Amino acid sequence: PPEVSPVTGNPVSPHYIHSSTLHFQDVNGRSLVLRGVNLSGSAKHPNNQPSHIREGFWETAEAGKGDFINKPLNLDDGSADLHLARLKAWGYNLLRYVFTWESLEHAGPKEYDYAYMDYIIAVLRKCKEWGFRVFMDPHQDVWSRFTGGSGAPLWTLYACGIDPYHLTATAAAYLHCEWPSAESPKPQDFPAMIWGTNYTHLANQTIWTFFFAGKTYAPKCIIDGKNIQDFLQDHFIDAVGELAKRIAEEAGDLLDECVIGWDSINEPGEGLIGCKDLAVIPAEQQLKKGPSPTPIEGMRLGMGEAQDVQAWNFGPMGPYRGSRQTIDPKGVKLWLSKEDDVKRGSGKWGWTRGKEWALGTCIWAHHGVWEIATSTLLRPDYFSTLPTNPGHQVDFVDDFWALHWLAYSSRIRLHHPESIHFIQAPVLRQPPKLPESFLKGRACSSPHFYDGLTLMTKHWNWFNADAIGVIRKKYWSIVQAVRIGEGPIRKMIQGELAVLKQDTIDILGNYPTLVGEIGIPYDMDDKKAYGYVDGGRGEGDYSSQQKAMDCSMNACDGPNCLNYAIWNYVPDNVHEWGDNWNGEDLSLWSVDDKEPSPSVIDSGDFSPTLILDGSRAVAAFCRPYPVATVGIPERIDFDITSTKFKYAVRVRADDIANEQVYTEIYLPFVHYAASLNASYSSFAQLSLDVTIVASHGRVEIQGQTLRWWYPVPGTGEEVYTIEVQRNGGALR
Ligand SMILES: COc1cccc(-c2ncc(CN3CCC(O)(CO)CC3)s2)c1
């Protein structure tokens, strides 16, 4: 590709990564593959405040505090060098750095935590040390920690006129700190993945509608002279812009060589935007679990009125209706009273609320959606149209999300001129058509893909379903989407990943695709692998988890050959609480599963304790893959049982191929070492006991690095293959 940047026109650094085609590319044309992890989910909450501890939860945040120092990596006690060494030893060259809006602007509006940004820069320098490519993830989950997840600082809830201490009583949000109640919390009983249902409760339904479409559906909500939409978007964009600016100014050496780009706002909520009927819950809403009130039922609850709501259980094929429970807030209203807005809201944080922003009562009824006197729905399709143009049916992705991404993208490149725009469309949604006025030949599709069944049920079922195919109207009967057996289930999920790749070619353009999140739950079968059930039988047996991860990872192999960042790597993962967030346990490594410099790891002469101890199903996520390829990757296939690894490339006449430009393949010690015994390890070093058969050219192995030289075809294009296998089968 051109030595000049398609964004700037300026010449490119020798470590520039080209993202102008369907694949990442270096300056010498080699097609790059980026595989790593998300680091880390531990940075979603401050120090000494995991999701299940309510003590100190509100008091610190109301004090404007937010101690996120040493999360994800502790730079004080030297633990960071070990974790990074373990990730480089696993063949990973990518990191999705997680940070949240709360950790940057917790003190107050435009009161930024520069000490934490300096910490982030310090961690980013260490990842650069280790040769990791990083792209930043502005992370959030159901808006904020205080609405059940992570992301926004506490004052943003007050910014929308919401009383944070009336959330549980109105069912506007389920929090792990206050489940099933703030009076008698039992966070051990927190249902599986129920936190995600918060997107469909009143708090997230209100805030997200304010965020993306405040000026359209809540024009009466003025704060500091501007609508709540501009107030929340500008503050978040400015906060992320501050971190980008401090990186470019204080440590510009990190841009492009280490920090290659920036992701969009992680998994944004759609609020009530596009709701065709507030009286019902659409059948296309994939996720329903627990008490699931309809929008109007959630609004009536938000006004302190009792409702009898559908209860949903998650069966073997999606949610299904169960109980019908009565939620009785006993008059407690979600909405902040004006007196409390003076003491804790507007007057506490230093903004002025408009005259027509009615407090203490439901803001949507104030816009005529329903009448509080009769509790009768008035405008059921209010969120399906533009009030200013009711003939226009709204689409959340095209009409509102894309507008936000334009504002966000311009601020990123303002401080990171060579930033790659990692575009993360909303969950289970195709990306929109975006102008290349903004993209400028430097972008990557950044969708998330999870085996939804395995994630929601915390089991590796003998069955599975083509969820994407059902969404995209591929089947006359939904039973056609069901697959049974590993073979059919693996081939099916690999076909779902292929549809994510076709969304890039068809909508955005010839840009790479990178699965920003993928993974499997480790606390499967009631934490059986942790010895919690059946008298401890099955402890340390991660066979169920291994096949689940092998499926999702193989789904990115095959003809896809995708880039991805596994979710996640939580350095402080424990069996009792998982990743210390809403009962999820998706981390590859934990201290409870126990029992160094860059060049030393590259030579391969390290203890196998590093690549084995503390890991779970390491055979699944530590896979052989081509780091750089002369040509274009055609197909990747890996089999854990026999360690056989076939790789096919497409080589052309104009591909550059000499002895300093070669195909690089990573062969892990986890599968291909002569032995991983710590006994043998103290006396002898690790080395690849492999058999290589290449259809073309020359090979060479050092440590864990395989090099493959081959001459380009004289005419047209051809396919070269290479096949690696450990001598004698799998390491037993
Ligand atoms: C077959 O089902 C599918 C298919 C494609 C995509 C998805 C999801 N995309 C985002 C999801 C939820 N997110 C929230 C956070 C999470 O808990 C990690 O922290 C898990 C990921 S699912 C599910």
Numbering used by the authors: 4 to 598, 639 to 722, 778 to 830
Article excerpt on this structure:
C. neoformans sterylglucosidase 1 (Sgl1), the first gene/protein identified with a sterylglucosidase activity, converts erg-glc to ergosterol and glucose. Our analysis of structures of C. neoformans Sgl1 reveals a Y-shaped hydrophobic active site pocket that generates specificity for erg-glc and which is not present in human and bacterial glucosylceramidases. Sgl1 is an ideal pharmacological target with broad spectrum since Sgl1 is widely conserved in fungi and there is no obvious homolog in humans.
Hit 1 is a piperidine derivative with good solubility (clogP 1.49) and an IC50 of 1 µM in our primary screen with res-glp as the substrate. To aid future medicinal chemistry optimization, we determined co-crystal structures of Hit 1 and Hit 9 with C. neoformans Sgl1 at 2.8 and 2.3 Å resolutions, respectively. Both compounds bound within the active site and formed a series of polar interactions near the catalytic site with the planar aromatic rings of the compounds occupying space in the buried hydrophobic pocket. The overall position of Hit 1 and Hit 9 were notably similar to the predicted docked erg-glc-binding pose. The piperidine ring of Hit 1 formed hydrogen bond interactions with the active site residues Glu270, Trp570, and Glu587, while the methyl-pyrrolidine ring of Hit 9 formed key interactions with Lys47, Glu270, and Glu587. In contrast, Hit 1 alone or in combination with fluconazole resulted in no CFU recovered from the brain.
